[PDB]
Each structure stands twice: as C-alpha cells, then as structure tokens.
Ligand binder design. Structure first.
Ligand SMILES: O=C(CCCCNC(=O)Nc1ccc(S(=O)(=O)N2CCN(c3cc(Cl)cc(C(F)(F)F)c3)CC2)cc1)NO
Ligand SMILES: [Mn+2]
Ligand SMILES: [Mn+2]
Length: 238
C-alpha cells in the first residue's frame, strides 16, 4: 500500500498532533510501499536554517521511516513552501514538484497540494505567485532569522476556499489521469467527475484537527481513513 497525508499543520503549540504523527510514523508508515506528504506538514516555515527543535524531531522521525526502507516524498503546501533541500537531507525526504503523476499499482494518479485548484480565490493566487517567485524567496531567506520570525508572526496574526471544478478537469486532462489526490481544502471526500471521456475521481485528504487522516492506495482499492492520534486504551464501566 501507498500512503498519502497532508495538512498536519505541525506546531509546537499542538503537541497532540505531533504525537499522533510520530505514532503514525512508528507504526502504519513502516509497512507502506511509500509515503507521500502532500503539503502543509508544518503550520509555518521560514527556512531550513530555523533551529526550531520540532523541525529536527520531525526530520529524525521521518528519517527513521526512510531508513526502514519506505521512501518518503513531499509536495509543498501553502504554509510550508519554503521547505528546502537541507530539510530534505535531514529528513531523508524527496522534494517533488507541485504536480506529480504516479503509477500506483497500474493506476495513474495525479497528486498535488490542491491550493492551485482553488482558482476562484484570485487574491490568494496572486499572493502565491509572489511567494513562489525565486528571487523573492531568495531575498526573504537572506533576511536574519529573527527578522523572518517577526515577519511570520506578524503575517500569521492577520474558511478555506474550495476547488474550482473546471480547474480539476483541466488538471486531470493535462495529465490524462482518472484519479487525483490532494489536500489543502480540509474537506475529506471522494468526488466523481468526468475527465478524458471517462469517469474520474478526486480524493481529498483531511486536516489533522482532532483525528488523523490518510489515503491508502492498494492494488485493489482506494481508502480514506480516519484514526485517532494516540493509542485509545479501552476500559470498562459497570
Ligand atoms: O484560500 C486558499 C489559500 C489559503 C490561504 C493561504 N494563505 C497562506 O498560506 N498564508 C501564510 C502562509 C505561510 C506563512 S509563514 O508563517 O510560514 N511564512 C510567512 C513569511 N513567509 C514569506 C515568504 C516570502 Cl518568499 C516572502 C514573504 C514576505 F515578502 F511577505 F515577507 C514572506 C514565509 C512563510 C504565513 C502566511 N485556497 O482556497
Ligand atoms: Mn491545510
Ligand atoms: Mn493548504
């Protein structure tokens, strides 16, 4: 099986999510053929030189999955688009492009974070175009870490728009797939549509708000799975 997760929004103020992700990496992920993280792994990212201990904790945990023989891949989200090759090396993850076509047991599947499908949010797409401009990222990353932290804290102090159905069809026809997996919108669901003259499906990951969410693709099926962060020990009441 191949696993997909997204929209964890890890942060030191939410240790329950971190614990849930560490439990996921120690258990389920170790049995996978591959793990794809489709963006928004972190609530924020201001560059790989950030000494935030959570980053090293997460990198070590992911690296243990990689060393266990499970390749891990990352597509950037709207929150963590500055994740770079230094973190990729620390974590053992492979950085992928904003759209990737996968062969999953003979099924061609398009994966992406999903924010680029939300083409009705014209203001966001303009912001996205700016912060994905390479010379702008290079200038921001050049600023001192304490400045970047102040910029980020100020900006974060300032409802997620859903996908545009025509953008979905465009993407699945550009890639000639019948299957699309994405996150970003926080509306876990399976949508049927038509692409390339045939039925097509759009599978949406959940955010890790109160429980975890993953998509698990097998040779036989596609599974959207919700599970508790921590081991829920049963006990009995007379
Ligand atoms: O609705 C939708 C979309 C949903 C809403 C999208 N909004 C959203 O993602 N906001 C946001 C994301 C990340 C952060 S951050 O804290 O991690 N961090 C802030 C500073 N960052 C920066 C980088 C560069 Cl290159 C340049 C600058 C500059 F020039 F501004 F200083 C700053 C790096 C990132 C802060 C806010 N879809 O339907
Ligand atoms: Mn998200
Ligand atoms: Mn997002």
């Amino acid at each position: 099986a191949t696993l997909f997760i997204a929209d964890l929004h890890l942060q030191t103020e939410e240790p329950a999510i971190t614990a849930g992700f560490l439990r996921f990496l120690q258990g389920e992920a170790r049995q996978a053929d591959a793990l794809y993280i489709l963006g928004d792994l972190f609530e924020a990212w201001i560059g790989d030189d950030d000494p935030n201990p959570l980053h090293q904790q997460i990198a070590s945990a992911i690296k243990a999955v990689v060393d266990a023989g499970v390749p891990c891949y990352f597509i950037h989200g709207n929150r963590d688009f500055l994740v770079g090759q230094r973190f990729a090396r620390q974590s053992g993850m492979i950085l992928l492009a904003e759209e990737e076509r996968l062969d999953l047991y003979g099924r061609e599947v398009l994966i992406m974070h999903g924010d680029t499908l939300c083409t009705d949010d014209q203001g966001y797409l303009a912001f996205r175009a700016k912060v994905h401009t390479p010379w702008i990222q290079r200038l921001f990353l050049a600023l001192p870490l304490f400045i970047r932290h102040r910029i980020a804290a100020r900006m974060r102090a300032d409802e997620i728009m859903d996908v545009n159905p025509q953008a979905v069809v465009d993407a699945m026809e550009r890639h000639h797939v019948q299957w699309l997996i994405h996150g970003h919108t926080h509306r876990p669901a399976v949508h049927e549509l038509q692409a390339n003259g045939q039925p097509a499906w759009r599978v949406v990951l959940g955010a890790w708000h109160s429980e975890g969410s993953m998509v698990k693709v097998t040779p036989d099926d596609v599974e959207l799975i919700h599970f508790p962060f921590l081991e829920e020990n049963l006990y009995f009441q007379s």
